[PDB]
Structure formats: C-alpha cells, structure tokens
Write an enzyme that holds these catalytic residues in place. Structure first.
Site, PDB file in Angstrom:
ATOM      1  N   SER A   1      -0.838  15.692 -11.800  1.00 23.15           N
ATOM      2  CA  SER A   1      -1.092  15.361 -13.205  1.00 23.15           C
ATOM      3  C   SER A   1      -1.319  16.632 -13.992  1.00 23.15           C
ATOM      4  O   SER A   1      -1.900  17.583 -13.458  1.00 23.15           O
ATOM      5  CB  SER A   1      -2.299  14.394 -13.292  1.00 23.15           C
ATOM      6  OG  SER A   1      -2.703  14.185 -14.571  1.00 23.15           O
TER       7      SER A   1
ATOM      8  N   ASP B   1       0.850  -1.188   0.000  1.00 27.08           N
ATOM      9  CA  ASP B   1       0.000   0.000   0.000  1.00 27.08           C
ATOM     10  C   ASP B   1       0.886   1.237   0.000  1.00 27.08           C
ATOM     11  O   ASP B   1       1.382   1.649   1.064  1.00 27.08           O
ATOM     12  CB  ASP B   1      -0.860  -0.033   1.267  1.00 27.08           C
ATOM     13  CG  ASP B   1      -1.788   1.150   1.326  1.00 27.08           C
ATOM     14  OD1 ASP B   1      -1.911   1.859   0.326  1.00 27.08           O
ATOM     15  OD2 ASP B   1      -2.401   1.339   2.411  1.00 27.08           O
TER      16      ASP B   1
END
Length: 330
Positions: free
Chosen positions: A199, A35
């Site tokens: 992004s 994770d």
C-alpha cells in the site's frame, strides 16, 4: 469457463464469509471459508473425530463415486489465530459457482482445533493463496484456482465481500458492473506464498494522506485489518476513550463512539473504509466496550488486509504469469 458464487457472512459482525461448494458425485454441498491467506482445501468429514464435530456438514468420501484416496498423503495446518487441523487426502470433483475441477485434492480432517468445532457455520476452508503454501505431504497439491486456471476465460478471481450483506466470488472474469470507477492494479510478491503487495499510505477520517509503504497481504480469511503500530495508534487517537487493552487483546473503544473512516492507498488510488466497518461490537455480551476492527500487526510479523479492508473494495486476484492485485471502489 467461469464460475460465480455468493458468499455470505456467518454472523452479524462479518466475522467470516461462507461460500457453498459442491464436492463429489452426487454433489455434497459444504459451506467453505474462502481464504486467500492459505492454500489447503480441507473439510469436515466422515473421518473427523466425532467429539470435534458440532453441527458442521461433513464430506463422506465413501458416498462419492468420484472420490479416490490419495494414497499416503497427509496434511496438517496451523493458522495465524492459533487454530489447526490435519488429516488425509482424497481427490474428487469440486465445483464452485458452476466452475468444475476434476481431481481436486480434498483434504479430509481427522482432527480440528476447538475454534473450528465451535463454529458450526464453517464446514472447512478453500485456500486461494499460492500453491507453494499447500501442506500436503509428501506430494504438495494445487489450489482449486491453480487447477481451474488453464480452463478459465481469464486467469483471475475476484472478491466482492459485503458489509453486513452477501457478496460474490467470481472466477475467470471481471464483472465490470460490480465496481465504480477504474481498477488500480499493484504488484504482488509471491515469495512468502501470499497475495503480498505494498500500500502507498493511509489517512484517518478527513485527515491528510500519509505517503508511506505498507507491505501486507490480501487475506479474505482474516476478519480484521492488521497494520503497523504507528498507523493503528494514529487511527485510535482520533476516537475519544479508545485504548489498547492487554486483557482484551487489542484496541477497544466506547460503544457510544462514532468511528472515523480509514483510507488506504493503492498506487495513486484510495480505498475508503467507512467507520462503521471498523466496529466489531461489544467485547462481551452487553458490554459498553467495543472491539476495534483495526489492530496492530506488531505481534504477527506481517500486515494483513483482512475482510475489514477488502470488503470496502472490489478486489481482483490476477493469477497471470506475473500476478497482480487490483482494487476498485464500489
């Protein structure tokens, strides 16, 4: 040193991925959920409340010649999905894919929430976010990656998750055979303890690319792609009959649909998530309503590039003094 381990979807939907991990001496192999959105290595154990164990493999520290209680140390964690676990701590030898760390903090669960009990395939979590998020008290502990770092050939690990197929976690090297083209690296903020990046925009299907900054985390422990409501609405507007269902808890779409791809920007590069990656199948067994793999982040407080996004890429988690992420197509 390096390590290389295969990671396998737990079910037909790629809801999560499990990677075998050797703990203790002799080795006890547990299948852990790696994770990159958390920083605790915790396991089902001989200490876990018996009614909360249902088919998991447990770690038994008393059977490990290298286990030592980390006296006084406790831990307690709550995840974004509402799940939780807590317990006490041992140090022990932990190996992943041939890479060994001695003195790793192995957090032994005394209690786990129902979602953990109900998932027989996950024996615990191995956190790969920054060690500043580790929950051990009163002495915070380091992740497996942070403890391995100095020994690695390069201070990196890579995630290569499969679509309905196994993939790979590598530590200490970048497999130049595992991706196509070049890797585009992007800056990381560690301020929240995550692999947080920005992004450069998105496109829906064959549509034009929208240049827009989307801050979010690269999180292997989250199944879906959680993005701003504007982006998500623009995606699902291209699917006839798709709608946000408050009863189901997100966007659903007709199982008869063919889904468009979704592209996200990494600098000037583009990662394309095929439409089939966005199909999470019937909302309940036999339903003709299917659950979408792109959902709104608006009720989270962060955007999350979870497995839906990451499995479309070869992803480099660069743990150099200035961390960075890299993405390549594959």
């Amino acid at each position: 040193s390096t390590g290389s381990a295969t990671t396998t979807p737990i079910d037909s939907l790629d809801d999560a991925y499990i990677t075998p991990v050797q703990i203790g001496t002799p080795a006890q192999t547990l299948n852990l959920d790696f994770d990159t959105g958390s920083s605790d290595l915790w396991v089902f154990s001989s200490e876990t409340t018996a009614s909360e164990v249902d088919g998991q493999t447990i770690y038994t520290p008393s059977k490990s010649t290298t286990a030592k209680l980390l006296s006084g140390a406790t831990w307690s964690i709550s995840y974004g999905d509402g799940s939780s676990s807590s317990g006490d701590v041992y140090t022990d030898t932990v190996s992943v894919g041939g890479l060994t760390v001695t003195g790793q903090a192995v957090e032994s669960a005394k209690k786990v929430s129902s979602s953990f009990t109900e998932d027989s395939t996950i024996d615990g979590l191995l956190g790969l976010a920054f060690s500043t998020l580790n929950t051990v008290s009163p002495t915070q502990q380091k992740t497996f990656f942070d403890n391995a770092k100095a020994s690695l050939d390069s201070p990196v690990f890579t995630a290569d998750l499969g679509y309905h197929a196994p993939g790979t976690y590598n530590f200490g090297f970048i497999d130049t055979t595992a991706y196509t083209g070049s890797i585009t690296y992007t800056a990381v903020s560690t301020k929240q303890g995550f692999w947080e990046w920005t992004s450069t925009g998105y496109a829906v299907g064959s549509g034009t690319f929208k240049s827009t900054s989307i801050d979010g985390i690269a999180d292997t422990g989250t199944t879906l792609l959680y993005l701003p409501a504007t982006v998500v609405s623009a995606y699902w507007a291209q699917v006839s009959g798709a709608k946000s269902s408050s009863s189901v808890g997100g966007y659903v779409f007709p199982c008869s649909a063919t889904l468009p791809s979704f592209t996200f920007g990494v600098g000037s590069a583009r990662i394309v998530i095929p439409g089939d990656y966005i199909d999470f199948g019937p909302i309940s067994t036999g339903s003709s309503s299917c659950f979408g793999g792109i959902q709104s982040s608006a009720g989270i407080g962060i955007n999350i590039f979870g497995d839906v996004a990451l499995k479309a890429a070869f992803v480099v988690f660069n743990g150099a003094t200035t961390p960075t992420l890299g993405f390549a197509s594959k």
